[PDB]
Write an enzyme that holds these catalytic residues in place. Structure first.
Site, PDB file in Angstrom:
ATOM      1  N   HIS A 208      75.441  -7.550  50.215  1.00  0.00           N
ATOM      2  CA  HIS A 208      75.879  -6.175  50.127  1.00  0.00           C
ATOM      3  C   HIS A 208      74.764  -5.194  50.331  1.00  0.00           C
ATOM      4  O   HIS A 208      75.019  -4.017  50.592  1.00  0.00           O
ATOM      5  CB  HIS A 208      76.554  -5.887  48.804  1.00  0.00           C
TER       6      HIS A 208
ATOM      7  N   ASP B 273      78.669 -10.750  51.846  1.00  0.00           N
ATOM      8  CA  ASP B 273      78.808  -9.738  50.804  1.00  0.00           C
ATOM      9  C   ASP B 273      79.811 -10.138  49.706  1.00  0.00           C
ATOM     10  O   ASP B 273      81.026 -10.176  49.939  1.00  0.00           O
ATOM     11  CB  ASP B 273      79.273  -8.436  51.468  1.00  0.00           C
TER      12      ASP B 273
ATOM     13  N   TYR C 241      77.610   9.709  49.764  1.00  0.00           N
ATOM     14  CA  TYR C 241      78.022   8.694  48.808  1.00  0.00           C
ATOM     15  C   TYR C 241      79.311   9.149  48.122  1.00  0.00           C
ATOM     16  O   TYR C 241      80.351   8.501  48.255  1.00  0.00           O
ATOM     17  CB  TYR C 241      76.930   8.369  47.783  1.00  0.00           C
TER      18      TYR C 241
ATOM     19  N   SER D  93      78.813   1.613  51.102  1.00  0.00           N
ATOM     20  CA  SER D  93      79.704   1.313  49.981  1.00  0.00           C
ATOM     21  C   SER D  93      80.836   2.331  49.806  1.00  0.00           C
ATOM     22  O   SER D  93      81.787   2.367  50.594  1.00  0.00           O
ATOM     23  CB  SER D  93      78.910   1.194  48.679  1.00  0.00           C
ATOM     24  N   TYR D  94      80.738   3.135  48.747  1.00  0.00           N
ATOM     25  CA  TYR D  94      81.716   4.162  48.499  1.00  0.00           C
ATOM     26  C   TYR D  94      81.532   5.179  49.604  1.00  0.00           C
ATOM     27  O   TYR D  94      82.510   5.626  50.215  1.00  0.00           O
ATOM     28  CB  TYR D  94      81.528   4.806  47.129  1.00  0.00           C
TER      29      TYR D  94
END
Ligand SMILES: CS(=O)(=O)n1c(-c2ccc(Cl)cc2Cl)c(CN)c2ccccc21
Ligand SMILES: CS(=O)(=O)n1c(-c2ccc(Cl)cc2Cl)c(CN)c2ccccc21
Lengths: 727, 727
Positions: free
Chosen positions: A701, A669, A508, A591-592
């Site tokens: 998402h 998303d 992450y 995500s990140y």
């Protein structure tokens, strides 16, 4: 002889039992016995049926949630639940009289109500409907409409818009009753010039033309929503004249430019605290506003403002801290950075600038949990110097040295990650133990902090897990440039340190992230280790949280640098542990993490064979403004456009020739836009790199559809198995 | 010792030479000598430089195309070419005086002109700009604006909208000058209530918010565009008064419901023929309209109407045939079905119903190419009973028995697929030979039909091809239920009929399709056979064209049935030829082929291991109305909704568990909408089938970007190699 298979994860074959309760008074709470709601007593553990299942057999509708009015006279019923974004949804509501045992069938709450909340005491009611606020003084009487300006996708009264919901409040709601229910504080959001994100929605196969969704969404540097704050006096609401809402204006220093309302907290009946943030998220002001009786207006003395600002980066972990006021409201506590950069509890005094710290050291206070006239109760990671542990500590208000740990020694072997739930006057507390052993739930009385009984010990799960070859869990640190950096490993069953294993790096690595903790989990990694003998690891490098500013502010204005290199360096360290087949190392993230995963695969380090990016940010100009600008500033020649330009995955497309790559995005998303992965996929096609794509129709998402969840993890497992040559 | 590799196809290592010319008079044409344009003479083969390269060095802009005014006095120059759809584009235009040798710098044609055309004689000029029509009588004089109603995305004057362009005219233009340039016939399209297809366009990485494209596009059963037809008299255009456009109204039988203008053809200076089609595409009317001198208006006698209708399906191959009028305009020729259902040439007489056929038999006339006062020149597939052959035939107008083949015997071994280009009065013709040998281009004089010279023989290519192991090409038929059904095979170099090969079935199989021909080609299949030893095959089954109505009308109102089964059956036949590894059989197609590919993979036949669908239609309700309804009627309970519902790929999602599947779609495809593949991908995810996807950012229906074209074929080859276990 059996292992944790894929289907065990995708079908919840081994389910973790929670113990989810909610305190009604200071010694009475509720629990859901599969079908029944009981009132458990905090003294004896005797429960009487509060609400039977067959109470709403005749209702006809399925009941999503319920809510008891503070006095215990009414119950609010939630149904026709339609989800919007992360926290927002829309529901039909019914009020049921508990003493008369019947549905209030007059002046009923409208369909498509955006938010409802009881007042802290009694049974008052405030709801938002078509972006306007309404107040019900009695469940069966007409509601006074407080606002009239509410307009769809433009004016939000008493609720948040997209970006405030996601990034600022973590709530749909923007209402705040005063402690005894006299005043209703609300916020208003103007989105007039905020640009729209647009995307298809393909819907059911029976829809002939795809629909187009349009959400006001400020990407980095674009026009933000604007905000005003109001307080209305519910006790003097009139049938005949419209209700007058007193505006508290933002302070001088905040008005000069773009700003945020980032925190609303009532101190006493006539006292309220506002925290404003600058768009450049390093300067924040806290206004404290009192009520003037003769005026009927609110006045915040300048001499009561407090500045929370930061020289080395953004203020707060994700937003500035909330205040916890003493009863008389002349004094409060909050979590700020100390002079050595670690987050601790400062004792503030209403009328003065300087605050005095009550806790100190090389470790961080996570949250303030409750304060009484005698004790402040907080969680920190101090125990055994473990940033990834959570323990409850009580501190004496008459002596800052006298600090007891309430959770550390309860069960030191099975239990290291605690969270707490205090009763309505902090007489009792529920402790949730989250790992490393099986979740444990206990109840205690805070008068003498002694245990009362075990609420849930997951022995039902424990018995079943002996029949299965489970993976083990190593939390530890390594030394880089004289700093500790923690990592965890999900190690395959019967782990052999002389053999050579395939390694999946799970990433992450966002600002203030923490992937290395002491939490028991049953996820994909469990299966991956257990059935496929893959060592999955995580590593909290620079820019990870709960270790001080020095580590967390490292990536300030430099997203997509240190934390990326630190992930590569992590694997390099892991393969130098000697139980790692350095020919079969993979990276994956969401995500990140998706981004980091992509920045690493595009790094050209040569360390990584393949990797998967799910819903990745691809360049920061494409992400919502409040999150981005918090760590990146503005994409302008005068601010930081250069590092916006210099840190995209598209620019690293050439190096992807060296790796194998699966990119996955949900087409619907609203958070990390499909646009992001579409711009990646293009960059690669352009420089002739082959990769793998999987779009997910109408998934958002979370890609958390019942069926998509299964399908995405199946798809990834096939990808990972094949990239590691596992049949 | 070398083979035709993937990079030979993706890089054009072996390039086929064309000979692209355009007749200026009846004995003079033009050719592009890499950089130079010459005027070649049809008598001697002597050429003088007509236009040097350094003529437009000073222009500053890159010149996309040119166009000579019929008298040879002006040249129209095209630049800033911006493509829209299949045929539509937008360009800046300049006119250059050929005798004065200079750019006309007054009254210049505007930027963003949608279409321009010279009048058939002289140097008049009609252009469409912001959907309105303008006429220039002299290159340096003001233009008279004929229309005023033109409005973007709504009113189209003298140009087509999406669906007319794609499905009806195959042109952007909707203007028709009369033979000597006096009248300008134009069409008008109303899209007012035609619904919009919407989709993102992600564009350059420097675009922060995806753009949303909105095209008026009628999906099956939705509201169609409506049409009106006008004739304006250019000779009497005034500076002072607006030009008056005489409307020719559609006939009684066409007005009663939804209809199409599907053909406009000038017969003489004062005679024009219109062909109207019903929305239910089995009834068409042809109106013939004559100019009334006194009236100044056009009158089409009812007694001159002609009905072209079909009991067994839709009228025409894809649209009704065009007429070819004798000089005096009292008689015409067109291609209709004969009583036994094959397409031949009927000699129509202006004033009577019954027409007499001039050709006959079990084979089909393909096109009418030119008629003189002595001969009709046409192409058919009669030669050696080969539906996939094309040959030129001349027929004597004074004796219908005297029919000469002009191309059959020229080179029977190398040449079987011919196409023709006649001079301005049919004195000379260019023959394009397309296969099975290397393309051959020759010139002949039609007075005695003798050859004059070889224009291009591709010997430059021939020499290079001897150095490479090329695949061979088998065209043949099989017998199913007493009918011939043709197939072709690209057979690997050094083909061994005792060995067992992997087979790729290449499918299109749309109504009136033909994948089995005698055309030399260098495509992916060439590489697949040459380098990877895969037998790629194609098979024209039921619903395929050029074989009579019996075969072609077979799939009427039954799309996604016979032609699908006939593909499966084709493979079953191929594996019963015994040189086929029936464990490694795959199917792939694009568009309609994409659909059949997906319907076959979802059939549960067990015959097929894997397959690739590129830009597939997934259910017929999602595709444009004119194409769909032509074969399917209306998706209503009273028409054919049942078979719309009963023939989707989504409904066959379960059976995909048996196969391996790659679905590819360009995200900015305006033709077959991404929606289609997005609805498939969903269906699969829902029933737990794993597959492979590849979206293509901003690629349209052709996925024909320089880079995407490379990337998609690379990706597919990897998929096919691996599905066949080829390393
Ligand atoms: C799951 S997440 O850590 O990625 N996450 C992110 C998040 C952070 C960064 C990026 Cl690039 C993407 C997301 Cl979803 C947000 C948005 N601040 C959030 C809110 C509440 C709970 C979890 C959240
Ligand atoms: C390449 S195509 O055969 O698929 N094709 C199709 C076509 C037919 C059916 C389907 Cl499902 C899709 C397409 Cl692109 C059309 C539309 N009528 C067309 C026009 C001009 C030239 C080629 C065309």
């Amino acid at each position: 002889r059996k292992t944790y298979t894929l289907t065990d994860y995708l079908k919840n074959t081994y389910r973790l039992k929670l113990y989810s309760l909610r305190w009604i008074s200071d010694h009475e709470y509720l629990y859901k016995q599969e079908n029944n709601i009981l009132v458990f007593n905090a003294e004896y553990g005797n429960s009487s049926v509060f609400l039977e299942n067959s109470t709403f057999d005749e209702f006809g509708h399925s009941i999503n949630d319920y809510s008891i009015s503070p006095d215990g006279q009414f119950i609010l019923l939630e149904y026709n639940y339609v989800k919007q974004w992360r926290h927002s949804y829309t529901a039909s509501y019914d009020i049921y009289d508990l003493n008369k045992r019947q549905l209030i069938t007059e002046e009923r709450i409208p369909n498509n109500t955006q938010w409802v909340t009881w007042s802290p005491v009694g049974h008052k009611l405030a709801y938002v409907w078509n972006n306007d606020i309404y107040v019900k003084i009695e469940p069966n009487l007409p509601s006074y409409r407080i606002t009239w300006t509410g307009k769809e996708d433009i004016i939000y009264n008493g609720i948040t818009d997209w970006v405030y919901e996601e990034e600022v409040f973590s709530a749909y709601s923007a209402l705040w009753w005063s402690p005894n229910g006299t005043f209703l504080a609300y916020a208003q959001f103007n989105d007039t010039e905020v640009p729209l994100i647009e995307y298809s929605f393909y819907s059911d196969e029976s829809l002939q033309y795809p629909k187009t969704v349009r959400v006001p969404y400020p990407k980095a540097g674009a026009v933000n929503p604007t905000v005003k704050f109001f307080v209305v006096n519910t006790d003097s609401l009139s049938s005949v004249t419209n209700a007058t809402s007193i505006q508290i204006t933002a302070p001088a220093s905040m008005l000069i430019g773009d700003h945020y309302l980032c925190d609303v907290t009532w101190a006493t009946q006539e006292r309220i605290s506002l925290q404003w943030l600058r768009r450049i998220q390093n300067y924040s002001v806290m206004d404290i506003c009192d009520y003037d009786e003769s005026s009927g207006r609110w006045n915040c003395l300048v001499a009561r403002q407090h500045i929370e600002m930061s020289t080395t980066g953004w203020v707060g972990r994700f937003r500035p801290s909330e205040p916890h006021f003493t009863l008389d409201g002349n004094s409060f506590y909050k979590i700020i950075s100390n002079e050595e950069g670690y987050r601790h509890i400062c004792y503030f005094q209403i009328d003065k600038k300087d605050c005095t710290f009550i806790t100190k050291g090389t470790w961080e206070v996570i949250g303030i949990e409750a304060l009484t006239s005698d004790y402040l109760y907080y969680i920190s990671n101090e125990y055994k110097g473990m940033p990834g542990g959570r323990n409850l500590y009580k501190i004496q208000l008459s002596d800052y040295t006298k600090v007891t740990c309430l959770s550390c020694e309860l069960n030191p072997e099975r239990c290291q990650y605690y969270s707490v739930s205090f009763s309505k006057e902090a007489k009792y507390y529920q402790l949730r133990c989250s790992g490393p052993g099986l979740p444990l739930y206990t109840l205690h009385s805070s008068v003498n902090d002694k245990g009362l009984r075990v609420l849930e010990d997951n022995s039902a799960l424990d018995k079943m897990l002996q029949n299965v070859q489970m993976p083990s869990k190593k939390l530890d640190f390594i030394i880089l440039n004289e700093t500790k950096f923690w990592y965890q490993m999900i190690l395959p069953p019967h782990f052999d340190k002389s053999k050579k294993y395939p390694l999946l790096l799970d990433v992450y690595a966002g600002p203030c992230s923490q992937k290395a903790d002491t939490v028991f989990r049953l996820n994909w990694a469990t299966y991956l280790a257990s059935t496929e003998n893959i060592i999955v690891a995580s590593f909290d490098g620079r820019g990870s949280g709960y270790q001080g500013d020095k580590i967390m502010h490292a990536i300030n204005r430099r997203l997509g640098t240190f934390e990326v290199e630190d992930q590569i360096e992590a694997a390099r360290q892991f393969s130098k542990m000697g139980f790692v087949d350095n020919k079969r190392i993979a990276i994956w993230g969401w995500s990140y993490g998706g981004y980091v995963t992509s920045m690493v695969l595009g790094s050209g380090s040569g360390v990584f064979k393949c990797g998967i990016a799910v819903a990745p940010v691809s360049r920061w100009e494409y992400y919502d403004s409040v999150y981005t600008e918090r760590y990146m500033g503005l994409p302008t020649p005068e601010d930081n456009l250069d590092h916006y330009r210099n840190s995209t995955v598209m620019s690293r497309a050439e190096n992807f020739k060296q790796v194998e790559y699966l990119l996955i995005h949900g087409t619907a998303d609203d958070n990390v836009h499909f646009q992001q992965s579409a711009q990646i996929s293009k960059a690669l096609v352009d420089v002739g790199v082959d990769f793998q794509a999987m779009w997910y129709t109408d998934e958002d998402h979370g890609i958390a559809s019942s069926t998509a969840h299964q399908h995405i993890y199946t798809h990834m497992s096939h990808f990972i198995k094949q990239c590691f040559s596992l049949p």
